[PDB]
PDB file of C-alpha atoms and ligand atoms in Angstrom:
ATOM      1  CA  UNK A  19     -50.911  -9.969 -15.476  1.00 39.64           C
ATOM      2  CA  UNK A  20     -47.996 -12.232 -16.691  1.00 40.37           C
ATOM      3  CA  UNK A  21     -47.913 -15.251 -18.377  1.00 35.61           C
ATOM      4  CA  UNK A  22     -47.996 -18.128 -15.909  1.00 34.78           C
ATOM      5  CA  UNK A  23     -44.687 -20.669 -16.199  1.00 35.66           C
ATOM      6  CA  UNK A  24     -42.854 -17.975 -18.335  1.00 37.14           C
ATOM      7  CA  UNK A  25     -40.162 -19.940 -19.928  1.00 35.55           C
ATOM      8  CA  UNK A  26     -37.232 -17.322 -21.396  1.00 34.48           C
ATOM      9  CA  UNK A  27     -35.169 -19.975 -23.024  1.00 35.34           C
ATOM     10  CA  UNK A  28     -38.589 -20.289 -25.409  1.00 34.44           C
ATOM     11  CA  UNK A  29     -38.970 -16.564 -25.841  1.00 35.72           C
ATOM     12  CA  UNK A  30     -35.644 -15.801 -27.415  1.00 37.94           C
ATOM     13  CA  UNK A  31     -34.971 -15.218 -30.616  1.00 39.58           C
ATOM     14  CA  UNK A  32     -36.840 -13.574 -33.925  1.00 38.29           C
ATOM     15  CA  UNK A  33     -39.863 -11.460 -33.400  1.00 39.71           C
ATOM     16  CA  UNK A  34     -41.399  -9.218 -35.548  1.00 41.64           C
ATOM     17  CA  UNK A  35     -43.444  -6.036 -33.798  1.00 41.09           C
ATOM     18  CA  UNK A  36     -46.828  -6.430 -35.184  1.00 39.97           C
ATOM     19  CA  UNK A  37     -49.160  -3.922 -33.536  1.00 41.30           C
ATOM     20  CA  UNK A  38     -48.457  -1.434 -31.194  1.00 39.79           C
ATOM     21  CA  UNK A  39     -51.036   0.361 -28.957  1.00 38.60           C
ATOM     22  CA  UNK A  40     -49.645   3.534 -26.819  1.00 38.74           C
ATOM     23  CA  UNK A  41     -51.471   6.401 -24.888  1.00 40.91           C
ATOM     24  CA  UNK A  42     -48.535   9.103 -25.771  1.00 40.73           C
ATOM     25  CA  UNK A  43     -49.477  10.892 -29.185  1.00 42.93           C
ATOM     26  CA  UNK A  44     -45.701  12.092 -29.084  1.00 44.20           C
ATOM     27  CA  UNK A  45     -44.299   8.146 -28.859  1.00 44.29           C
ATOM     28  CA  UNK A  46     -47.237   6.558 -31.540  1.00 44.54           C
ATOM     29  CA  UNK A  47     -46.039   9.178 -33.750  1.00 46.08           C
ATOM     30  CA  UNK A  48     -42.229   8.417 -33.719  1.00 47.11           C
ATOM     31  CA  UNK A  49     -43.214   5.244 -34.040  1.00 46.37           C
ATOM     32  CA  UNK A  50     -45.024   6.037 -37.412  1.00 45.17           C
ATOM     33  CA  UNK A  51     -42.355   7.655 -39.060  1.00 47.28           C
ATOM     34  CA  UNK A  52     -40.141   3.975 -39.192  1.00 49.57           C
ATOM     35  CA  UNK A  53     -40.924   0.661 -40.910  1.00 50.11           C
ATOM     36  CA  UNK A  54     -39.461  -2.223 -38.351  1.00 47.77           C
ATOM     37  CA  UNK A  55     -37.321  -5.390 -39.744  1.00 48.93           C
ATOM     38  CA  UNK A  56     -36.999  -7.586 -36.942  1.00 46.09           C
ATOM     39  CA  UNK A  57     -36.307  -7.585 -33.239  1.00 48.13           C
ATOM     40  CA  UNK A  58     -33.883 -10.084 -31.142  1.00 48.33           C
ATOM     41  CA  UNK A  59     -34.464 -11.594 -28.136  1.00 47.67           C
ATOM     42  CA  UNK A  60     -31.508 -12.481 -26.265  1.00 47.14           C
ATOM     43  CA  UNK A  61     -30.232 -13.187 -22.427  1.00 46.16           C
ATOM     44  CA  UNK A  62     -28.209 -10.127 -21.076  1.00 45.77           C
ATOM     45  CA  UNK A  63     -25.253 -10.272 -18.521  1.00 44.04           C
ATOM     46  CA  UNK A  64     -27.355  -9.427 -16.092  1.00 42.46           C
ATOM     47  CA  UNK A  65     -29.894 -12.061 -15.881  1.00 45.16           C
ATOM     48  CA  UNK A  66     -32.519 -10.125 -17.736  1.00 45.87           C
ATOM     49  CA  UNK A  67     -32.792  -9.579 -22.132  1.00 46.62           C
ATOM     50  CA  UNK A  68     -31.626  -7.563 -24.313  1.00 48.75           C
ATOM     51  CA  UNK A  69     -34.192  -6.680 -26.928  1.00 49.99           C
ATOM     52  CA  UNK A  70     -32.496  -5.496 -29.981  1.00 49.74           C
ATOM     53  CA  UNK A  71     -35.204  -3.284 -32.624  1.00 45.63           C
ATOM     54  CA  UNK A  72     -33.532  -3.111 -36.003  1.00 46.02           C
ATOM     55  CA  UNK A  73     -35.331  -0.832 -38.670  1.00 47.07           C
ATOM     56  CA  UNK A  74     -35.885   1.683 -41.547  1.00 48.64           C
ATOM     57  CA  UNK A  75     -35.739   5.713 -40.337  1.00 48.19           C
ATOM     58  CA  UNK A  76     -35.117   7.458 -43.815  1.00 51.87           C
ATOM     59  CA  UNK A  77     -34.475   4.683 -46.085  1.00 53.02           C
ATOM     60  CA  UNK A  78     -31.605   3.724 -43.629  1.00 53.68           C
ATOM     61  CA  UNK A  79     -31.235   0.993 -41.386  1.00 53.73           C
ATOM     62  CA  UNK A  80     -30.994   1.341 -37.651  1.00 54.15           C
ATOM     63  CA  UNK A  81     -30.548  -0.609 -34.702  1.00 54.30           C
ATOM     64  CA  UNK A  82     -30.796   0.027 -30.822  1.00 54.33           C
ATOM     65  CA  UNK A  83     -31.044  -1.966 -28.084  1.00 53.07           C
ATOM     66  CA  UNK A  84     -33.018  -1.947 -24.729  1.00 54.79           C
ATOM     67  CA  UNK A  85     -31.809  -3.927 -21.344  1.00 53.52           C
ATOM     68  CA  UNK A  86     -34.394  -5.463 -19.504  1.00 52.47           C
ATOM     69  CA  UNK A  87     -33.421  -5.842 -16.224  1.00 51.43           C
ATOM     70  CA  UNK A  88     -35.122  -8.837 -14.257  1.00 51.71           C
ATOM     71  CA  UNK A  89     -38.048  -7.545 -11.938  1.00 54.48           C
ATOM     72  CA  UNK A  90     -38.046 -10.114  -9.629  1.00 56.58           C
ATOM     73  CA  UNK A  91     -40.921 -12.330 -11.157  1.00 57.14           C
ATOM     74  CA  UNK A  92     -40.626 -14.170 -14.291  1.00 57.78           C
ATOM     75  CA  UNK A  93     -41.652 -12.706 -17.434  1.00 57.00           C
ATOM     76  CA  UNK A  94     -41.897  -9.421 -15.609  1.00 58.35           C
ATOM     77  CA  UNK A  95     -38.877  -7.281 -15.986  1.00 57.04           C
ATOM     78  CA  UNK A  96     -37.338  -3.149 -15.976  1.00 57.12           C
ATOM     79  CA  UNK A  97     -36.329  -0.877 -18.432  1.00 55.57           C
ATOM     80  CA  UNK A  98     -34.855   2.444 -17.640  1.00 56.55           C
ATOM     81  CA  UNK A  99     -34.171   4.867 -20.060  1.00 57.07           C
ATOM     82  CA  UNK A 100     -30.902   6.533 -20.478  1.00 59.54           C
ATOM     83  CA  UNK A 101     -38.349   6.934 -15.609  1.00 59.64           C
ATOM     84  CA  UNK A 102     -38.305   3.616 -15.232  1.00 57.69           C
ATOM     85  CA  UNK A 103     -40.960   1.244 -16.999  1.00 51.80           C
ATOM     86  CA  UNK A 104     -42.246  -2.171 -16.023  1.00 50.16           C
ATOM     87  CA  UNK A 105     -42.218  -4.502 -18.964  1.00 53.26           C
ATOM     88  CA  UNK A 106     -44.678  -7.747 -18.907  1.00 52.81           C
ATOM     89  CA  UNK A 107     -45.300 -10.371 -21.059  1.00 51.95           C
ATOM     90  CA  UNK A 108     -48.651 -11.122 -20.679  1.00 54.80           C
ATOM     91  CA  UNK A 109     -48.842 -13.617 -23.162  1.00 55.90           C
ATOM     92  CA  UNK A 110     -47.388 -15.910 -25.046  1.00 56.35           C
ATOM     93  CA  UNK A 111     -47.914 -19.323 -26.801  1.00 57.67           C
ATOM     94  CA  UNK A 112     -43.739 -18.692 -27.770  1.00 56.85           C
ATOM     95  CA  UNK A 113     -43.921 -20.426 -31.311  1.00 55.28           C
ATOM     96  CA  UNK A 114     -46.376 -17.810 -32.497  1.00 55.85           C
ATOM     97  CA  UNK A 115     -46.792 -14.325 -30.567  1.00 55.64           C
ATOM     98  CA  UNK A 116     -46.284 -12.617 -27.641  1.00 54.35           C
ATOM     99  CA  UNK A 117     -48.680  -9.678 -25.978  1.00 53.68           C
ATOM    100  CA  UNK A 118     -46.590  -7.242 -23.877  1.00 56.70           C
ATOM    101  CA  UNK A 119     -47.439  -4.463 -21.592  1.00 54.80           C
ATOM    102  CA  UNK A 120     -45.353  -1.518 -20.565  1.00 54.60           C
ATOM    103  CA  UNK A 121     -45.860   1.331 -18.151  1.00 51.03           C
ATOM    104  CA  UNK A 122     -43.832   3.554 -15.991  1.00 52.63           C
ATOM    105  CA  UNK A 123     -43.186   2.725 -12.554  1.00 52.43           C
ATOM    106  CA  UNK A 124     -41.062   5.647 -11.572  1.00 48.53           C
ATOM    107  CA  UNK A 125     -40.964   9.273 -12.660  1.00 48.87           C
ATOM    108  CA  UNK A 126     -42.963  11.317 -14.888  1.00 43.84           C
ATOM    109  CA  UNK A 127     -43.286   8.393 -17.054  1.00 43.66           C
ATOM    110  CA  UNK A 128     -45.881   6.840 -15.012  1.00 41.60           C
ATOM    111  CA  UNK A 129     -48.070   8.557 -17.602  1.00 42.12           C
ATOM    112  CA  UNK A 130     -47.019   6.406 -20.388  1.00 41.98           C
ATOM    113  CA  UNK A 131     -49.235   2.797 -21.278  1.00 41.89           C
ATOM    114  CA  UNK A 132     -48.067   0.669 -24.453  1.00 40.50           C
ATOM    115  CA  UNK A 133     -49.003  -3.056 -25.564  1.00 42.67           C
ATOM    116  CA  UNK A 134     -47.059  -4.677 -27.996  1.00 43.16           C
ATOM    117  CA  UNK A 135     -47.851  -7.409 -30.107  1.00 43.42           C
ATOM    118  CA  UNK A 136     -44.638  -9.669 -31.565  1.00 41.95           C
ATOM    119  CA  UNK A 137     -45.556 -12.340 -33.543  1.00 41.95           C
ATOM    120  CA  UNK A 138     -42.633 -15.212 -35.025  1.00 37.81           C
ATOM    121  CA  UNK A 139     -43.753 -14.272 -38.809  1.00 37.72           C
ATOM    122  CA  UNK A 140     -43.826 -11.274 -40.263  1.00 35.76           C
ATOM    123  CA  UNK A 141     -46.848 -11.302 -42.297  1.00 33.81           C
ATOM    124  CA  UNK A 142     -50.370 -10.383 -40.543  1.00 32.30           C
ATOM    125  CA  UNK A 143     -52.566 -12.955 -39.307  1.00 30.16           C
ATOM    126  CA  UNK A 144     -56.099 -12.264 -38.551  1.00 28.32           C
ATOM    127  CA  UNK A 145     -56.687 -14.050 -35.586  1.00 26.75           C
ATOM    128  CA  UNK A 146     -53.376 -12.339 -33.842  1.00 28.72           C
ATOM    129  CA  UNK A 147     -54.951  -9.202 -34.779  1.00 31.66           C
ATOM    130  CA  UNK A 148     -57.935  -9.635 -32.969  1.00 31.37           C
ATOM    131  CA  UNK A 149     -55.862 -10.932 -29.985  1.00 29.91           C
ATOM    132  CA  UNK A 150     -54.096  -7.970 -29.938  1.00 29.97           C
ATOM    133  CA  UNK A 151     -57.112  -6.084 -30.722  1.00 30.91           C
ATOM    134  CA  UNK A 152     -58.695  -7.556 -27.595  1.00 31.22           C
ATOM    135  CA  UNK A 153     -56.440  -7.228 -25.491  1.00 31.57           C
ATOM    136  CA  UNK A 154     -55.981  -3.654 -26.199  1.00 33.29           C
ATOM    137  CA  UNK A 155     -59.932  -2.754 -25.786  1.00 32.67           C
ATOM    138  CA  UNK A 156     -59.490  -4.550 -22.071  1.00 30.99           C
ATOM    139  CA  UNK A 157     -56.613  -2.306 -21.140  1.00 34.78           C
ATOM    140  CA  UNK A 158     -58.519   0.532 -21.613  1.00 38.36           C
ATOM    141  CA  UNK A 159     -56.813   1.532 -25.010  1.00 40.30           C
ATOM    142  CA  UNK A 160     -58.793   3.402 -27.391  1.00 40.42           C
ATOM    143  CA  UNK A 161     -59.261   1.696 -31.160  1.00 40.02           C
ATOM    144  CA  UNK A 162     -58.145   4.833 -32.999  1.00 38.57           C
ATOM    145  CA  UNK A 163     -54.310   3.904 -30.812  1.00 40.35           C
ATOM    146  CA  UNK A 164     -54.303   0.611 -31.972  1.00 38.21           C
ATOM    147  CA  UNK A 165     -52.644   0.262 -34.884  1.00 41.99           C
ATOM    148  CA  UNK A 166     -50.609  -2.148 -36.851  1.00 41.31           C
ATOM    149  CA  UNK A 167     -46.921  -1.075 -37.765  1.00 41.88           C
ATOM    150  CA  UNK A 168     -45.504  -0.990 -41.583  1.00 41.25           C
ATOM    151  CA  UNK A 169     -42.996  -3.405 -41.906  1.00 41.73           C
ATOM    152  CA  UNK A 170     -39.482  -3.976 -44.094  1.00 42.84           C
ATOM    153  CA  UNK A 171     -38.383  -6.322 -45.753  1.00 41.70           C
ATOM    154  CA  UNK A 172     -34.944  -4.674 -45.191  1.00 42.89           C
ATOM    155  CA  UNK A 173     -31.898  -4.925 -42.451  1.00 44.94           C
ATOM    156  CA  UNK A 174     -32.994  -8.746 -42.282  1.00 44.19           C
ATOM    157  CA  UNK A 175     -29.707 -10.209 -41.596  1.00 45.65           C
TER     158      UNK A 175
HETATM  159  C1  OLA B 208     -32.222   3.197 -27.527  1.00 42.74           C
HETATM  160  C2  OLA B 208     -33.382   4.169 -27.348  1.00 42.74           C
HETATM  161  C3  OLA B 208     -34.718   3.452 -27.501  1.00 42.74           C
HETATM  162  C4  OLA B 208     -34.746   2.644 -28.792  1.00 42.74           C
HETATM  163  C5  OLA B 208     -35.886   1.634 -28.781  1.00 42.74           C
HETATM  164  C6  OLA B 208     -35.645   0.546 -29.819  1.00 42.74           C
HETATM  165  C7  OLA B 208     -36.925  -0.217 -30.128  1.00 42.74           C
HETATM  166  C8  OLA B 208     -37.818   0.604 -31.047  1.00 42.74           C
HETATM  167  C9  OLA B 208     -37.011   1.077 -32.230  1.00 42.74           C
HETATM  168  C10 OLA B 208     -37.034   2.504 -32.575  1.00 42.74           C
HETATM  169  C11 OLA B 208     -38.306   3.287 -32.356  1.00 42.74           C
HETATM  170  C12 OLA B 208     -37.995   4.746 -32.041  1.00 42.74           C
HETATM  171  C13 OLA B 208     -39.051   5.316 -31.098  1.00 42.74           C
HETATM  172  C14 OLA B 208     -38.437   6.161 -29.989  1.00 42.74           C
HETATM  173  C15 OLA B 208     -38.372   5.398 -28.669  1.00 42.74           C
HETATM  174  C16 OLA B 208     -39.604   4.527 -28.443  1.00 42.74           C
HETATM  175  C17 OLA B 208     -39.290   3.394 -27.472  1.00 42.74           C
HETATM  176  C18 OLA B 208     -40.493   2.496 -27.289  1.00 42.74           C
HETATM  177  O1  OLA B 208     -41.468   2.872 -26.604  1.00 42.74           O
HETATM  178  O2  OLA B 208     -40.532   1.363 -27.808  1.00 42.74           O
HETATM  179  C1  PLM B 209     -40.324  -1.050 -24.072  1.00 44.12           C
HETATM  180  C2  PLM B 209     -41.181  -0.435 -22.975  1.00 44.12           C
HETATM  181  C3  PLM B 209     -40.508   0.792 -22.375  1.00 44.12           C
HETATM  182  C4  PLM B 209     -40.905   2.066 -23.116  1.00 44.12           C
HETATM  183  C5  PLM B 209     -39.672   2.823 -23.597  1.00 44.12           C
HETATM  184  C6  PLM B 209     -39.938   4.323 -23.707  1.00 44.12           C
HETATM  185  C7  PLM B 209     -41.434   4.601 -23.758  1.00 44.12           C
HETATM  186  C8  PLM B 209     -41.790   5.860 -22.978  1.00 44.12           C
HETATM  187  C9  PLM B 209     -42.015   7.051 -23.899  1.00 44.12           C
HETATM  188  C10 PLM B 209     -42.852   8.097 -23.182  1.00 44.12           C
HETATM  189  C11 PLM B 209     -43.497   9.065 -24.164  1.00 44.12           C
HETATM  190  C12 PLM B 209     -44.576   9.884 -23.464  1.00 44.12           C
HETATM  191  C13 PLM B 209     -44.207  10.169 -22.013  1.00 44.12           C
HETATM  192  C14 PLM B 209     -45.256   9.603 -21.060  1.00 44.12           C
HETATM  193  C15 PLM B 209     -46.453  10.543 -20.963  1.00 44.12           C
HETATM  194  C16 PLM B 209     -47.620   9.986 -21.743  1.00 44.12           C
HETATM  195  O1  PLM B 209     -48.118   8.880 -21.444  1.00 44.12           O
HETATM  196  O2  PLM B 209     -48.109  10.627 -22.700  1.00 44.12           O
END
């Protein structure tokens, strides 16, 4: 689902990704081989966010950034990769964390499942781990692909 009442003005910003669960070995394992910073939230041009990933790939820091597009219900939105994906936030409690759930909706990448978990800190909570934990196990998610990413301390600015 999405989070009823999604508010976007309260969702931008400073996230850290937390824990990431994905059903392609080939994406878990890029994933691995980086330690995340931060992320930024922001509105795009077109009505939708531009999430902006900064992190570590070889003692180097690295930024890229992903348009959402709007979907047409709030808090859902569309990211197409230069397959298309939905992108959901499921929820959030905005001061805290934020669950998200991708999948493709066009193209070979139908295949492809991930949940996110963002939290506002970056240091790991329990209780947001078991959240995310959760709401992992209900997707259908195995544990062994749940898994909480290293983090930097680096690229912070
Ligand atoms: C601009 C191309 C996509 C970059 C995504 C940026 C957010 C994640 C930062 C780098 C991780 C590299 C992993 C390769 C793409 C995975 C995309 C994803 O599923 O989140
Ligand atoms: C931010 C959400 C959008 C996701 C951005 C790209 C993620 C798709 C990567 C696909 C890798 C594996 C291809 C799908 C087949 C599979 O599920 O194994």
């Amino acid at each position: 689902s999405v989070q009823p009442n999604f508010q976007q003005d309260k969702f931008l910003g400073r996230w850290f990704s937390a824990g990431l669960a994905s059903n392609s070995s080939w994406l878990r394992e890029k994933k691995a081989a980086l330690s995340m910073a931060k992320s930024v939230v922001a509105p795009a041009t077109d009505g939708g966010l531009n999430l902006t990933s900064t992190f570590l790939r070889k003692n180097q820091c690295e930024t890229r950034t992903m348009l959402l597009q709007p979907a047409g219900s709030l808090g859902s939105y569309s990211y197409r990769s230069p397959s298309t994906y939905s992108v959901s936030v499921v929820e959030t409690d905005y001061d805290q964390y934020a669950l998200l759930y991708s999948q493709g909706s066009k193209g070979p990448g139908e295949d492809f499942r991930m949940a996110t978990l963002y939290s506002r800190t970056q240091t790991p909570r329990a209780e947001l781990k078991e959240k995310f934990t959760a709401f992992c196990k209900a997707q259908g998610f195995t544990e062994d692909t749940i898994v909480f990413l290293p983090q930097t301390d680096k690229c912070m600015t």
